[PDB]
Each structure stands twice: as C-alpha cells, then as structure tokens.
Amino acid sequence: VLSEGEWQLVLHVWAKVEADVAGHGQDILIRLFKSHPETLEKFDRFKHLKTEAEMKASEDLKKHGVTVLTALGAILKKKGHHEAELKPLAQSHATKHKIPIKYLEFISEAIIHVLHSRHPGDFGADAQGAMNKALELFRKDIAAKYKELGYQG
Numbered sequence: 001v002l003s004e005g006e007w008q009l010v011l012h013v014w015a016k017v018e019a020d021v022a023g024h025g026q027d028i029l030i031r032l033f034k035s036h037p038e039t040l041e042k043f044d045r046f047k048h049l050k051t052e053a054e055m056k057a058s059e060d061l062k063k064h065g066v067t068v069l070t071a072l073g074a075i076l077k078k079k080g081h082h083e084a085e086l087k088p089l090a091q092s093h094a095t096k097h098k099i100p101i102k103y104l105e106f107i108s109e110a111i112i113h114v115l116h117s118r119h120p121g122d123f124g125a126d127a128q129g130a131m132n133k134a135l136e137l138f139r140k141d142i143a144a145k146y147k148e149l150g151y152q153g
C-alpha cells in the first residue's frame, strides 16, 4: 500500500499531466507501439499505422490516448480504493480485448518514461518510485481479476 506521502507525489505529477492529456496520450501510445510492436496488433483500428510520423498524424490515435489517460486518472485519484473503476476494465481487457498482464507492464514503462521526459522537476527518483508502486498496485489488482476469470496470463 502506498503511503499518503507517496500518493501526493503521484497526484502532483498527474495534475501536470492533465494540463495536456492529449499530448501525453500520444507520446505514451507511440512509445508503447514502437518498443513492443506486438501491442499494436491488438488494435484493429491502428494496425495500418507503419511509421512514427503516421502515428503522430492520426487524430483517432490522439483521441484514444485521451481515453486511456482519463480512465487511469480516475483510478489514481481513488488512491487505491478503485474496485468499481477497475472491475469493468479487467473484464473487458481479459475477456474481450485479450490483453495479457505483460502488456500492462509495457504500458506502465511507457507512462513512466513519458512523465520523466516532460516533467523532470516534478518527477525525481522519489516520484518515479511512487508512480511505479501505484502502477504495480493497478496491475496486481487486475491480475487477481484475470485469475478469477481464467485468463491469468
């Protein structure tokens, strides 16, 4: 469990992320797709994108980046009390989208990388540690739901 001090570090940088959700969403999805190409295959709507330039020019990709970050922000602001927000997500990602937990680990790495490049002053080692812990909590909770449903993997 994250301490009150750790949540403060997480939410402080997230407030900055909310200043430009669309730009952040783009950077994160593009990093995910370039670093782990297999993740792009899960998206019928993005499968046609072959270069970073094409990804950067896609308004649909930008719009969906807002979708991911808005859902994640709703979860982070619950400070661990995210049962109602996480349930629907785990259900859809395990049974409909078929996203293995490993991919959630990949997107967490992308999020951390982007926050570091855009918010150095508010994302030192202490904040990086807190953010990693918050993302691991998210993954641990999703993992349990996956196991219940028979998708642990």
Ligand code: HEM
Pocket (backbone or CB within 6 Å): 039, 040, 042, 043, 044, 045, 067, 068, 069, 071, 072, 088, 089, 092, 093, 097, 099, 103, 104, 107
């Ligand atoms: C922090 C991580 C994530 C969050 C908060 C998140 C959130 C969402 C949300 C809110 C939707 C909308 C409704 C729904 O279908 O449940 C969605 C759809 C989807 N997500 Fe994610 N997601 C995450 C990670 C991922 C990852 C890592 C992948 C794939 C590697 C993925 C693949 C999908 C797909 C395939 C859809 C549907 C796309 C479509 O409608 O065409 N998600 N996600």
